[PDB]
Amino acid sequence: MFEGFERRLVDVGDVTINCVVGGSGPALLLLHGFPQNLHMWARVAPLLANEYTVVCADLRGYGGSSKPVGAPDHANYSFRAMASDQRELMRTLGFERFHLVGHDRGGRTGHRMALDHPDSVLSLAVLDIIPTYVMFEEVDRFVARAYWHWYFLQQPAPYPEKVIGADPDTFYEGCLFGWGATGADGFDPEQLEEYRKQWRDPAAIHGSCCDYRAGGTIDFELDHGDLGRQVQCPALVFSGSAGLMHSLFEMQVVWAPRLANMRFASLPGGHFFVDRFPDDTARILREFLSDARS
Amino acid sequence: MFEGFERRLVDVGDVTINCVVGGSGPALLLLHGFPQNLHMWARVAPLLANEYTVVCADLRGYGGSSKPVGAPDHANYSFRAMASDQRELMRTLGFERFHLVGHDRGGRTGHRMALDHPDSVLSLAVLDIIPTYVMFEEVDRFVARAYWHWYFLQQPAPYPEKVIGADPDTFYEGCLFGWGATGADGFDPEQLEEYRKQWRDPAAIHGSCCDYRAGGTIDFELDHGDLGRQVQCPALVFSGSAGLMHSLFEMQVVWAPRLANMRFASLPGGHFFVDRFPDDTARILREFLSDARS
Ligand SMILES: [Mg+2]
Ligand SMILES: [Mg+2]
């Protein structure tokens, strides 16, 4: 995978970020989510590398990046800290400004990065997510059941860590395959093994739990404080139209207040649509990036 | 434990209910909750047996009672089904009417039994619970985090079953001890070993998960249909004042619309106060039962 891309472990502040870099053209940072890592972009990145310098990076707590022990207030795993790492990675790789695409946690990191450092983000695509603030503030019995892990993973360490660690493949496969009878079909075998191998690392089990602890505390408070602001660069809300999120919330409604320049796109898949629709994901991203740059 | 009590496995229809019976005087049925069984009453029952014929029974899906495979609609684990079993158990043991005390799932079973067969329940004590309907209709980010298991346990079989199955002791200890520093202290070793035998039983892991799946579906719907109806017999709302519940809800507010004759009592413990305050629990239940009968 990532034939021809340079593989780099870059020290940024107090953590090291694992990434692959390939291509030429404007920089494009692709950030993964849970329970995955930069390998979710194994097919999409090579397709866009004919026009962009594509960087796929692992968020702190995931894949090959540092996984520090979470602080009692979880602040070292807020999206502000996660975004800072990635923005500094890009600056180190020589890119002061860059386009950003983020799925799941990576989209949340991107949203926070655009609010914290508007000048660094040329465009923002958030894949299959609604704002973290809305997820919690408007939770109801249906949202809490669908997103049960948003609450289980917030339990104090080391409880989720020990429960997950007793059989991580079973635990994460549930988060990845979800409950449809299609469920595991469609994942590329090679990318799926990268999710498996990397998630069995107890330090990554811990780091991802800390990301979720922060989400419901520090991130929620930071997001609350920024409700009077909008992301100003061109933005794309890109959803899996056959997924649970597209079904419980209206994209326009939850995002319009956060994005000053918003476009929409969807593919007929679920939350992990990038895994099943690599080529079409690359196509939609390329069209949006072209629109953004115009 | 339960010295002098008779052990009975009683067929009530399509399930068999495990119970112990002791004492003399009016019938008193004590129903346990999650993640426990009739042994949570090992100290309280002998104290009350000097004035009541005390029956401590295992709910279907728990302890030594039948644990059928959950139906796709979870109806065989509704509180209506669980209540029917216990009312028939009492009738078979010779009692058409009895006092009822329930903690956690057992209190939910009791509320539903009083709504479905008011003439069979002479008095109803609900221990450390607020109504199922409220738990779900008024959920917010704090409630969902505190009662995360109400959402994890609703995930489709066999997922929670396999996650829990990999390390039952770690999973249920977190449910029983909680996150506080004095979490594990103060549980009687003998009673704890009986809860543990259940924790490790795959059929009980499944049964309890199905109880939670029904609670969020069939039970919520049945309860919705009965809003406005109040149980008429004397009732006691008995809570652990040092616990989470007492902290997020007001007992008066959530129970008043459900109980026409309501009294209150509390002990300075958490959700599992019965384990820590057997003598005082019996004292309070004795005082309430006397008041009820008078
Ligand atoms: Mg976070
Ligand atoms: Mg039930």
From Swiss-Prot, chains A, B:
Consequence of substituting F272A: Abolishes enzyme activity
Record note on what altering D128A does: Abolishes enzyme activity
Keyword match Membrane: no
Keyword Hydrolase: yes
BP GO annotations: acylglycerol catabolic process
Effect noted on mutating F34A: Abolishes enzyme activity
Residues at the catalytic site: D104 (nucleophile), H271 (proton acceptor)
Enzyme class of the recorded protein, top EC level: hydrolase
Signals that turn on the gene: Up-regulated by fluoroacetate. Not detectable in the absence of fluoroacetate, or when cells are grown on Luria broth.
Domain of life: Bacteria
Binding site for fluoroacetate: R105, R108, H149, W150, Y212
Biophysicochemical property: pH dependence: Optimum pH is 8.5-9.5.
Keywords in alphabetical order: Hydrolase
Pfam families documented for this protein: Abhydrolase_1
Residue ranges occupied by any AB hydrolase-1 domain in the UniProt entry: 26-151
Catalytic reactions on record: a haloacetate + H2O = a halide anion + glycolate + H(+); fluoroacetate + H2O = fluoride + glycolate + H(+)
Phenotype when changing Y212A: Abolishes enzyme activity
Assembly: Homodimer.
Family: Belongs to the AB hydrolase superfamily. Epoxide hydrolase family.
Protein name: Fluoroacetate dehalogenase
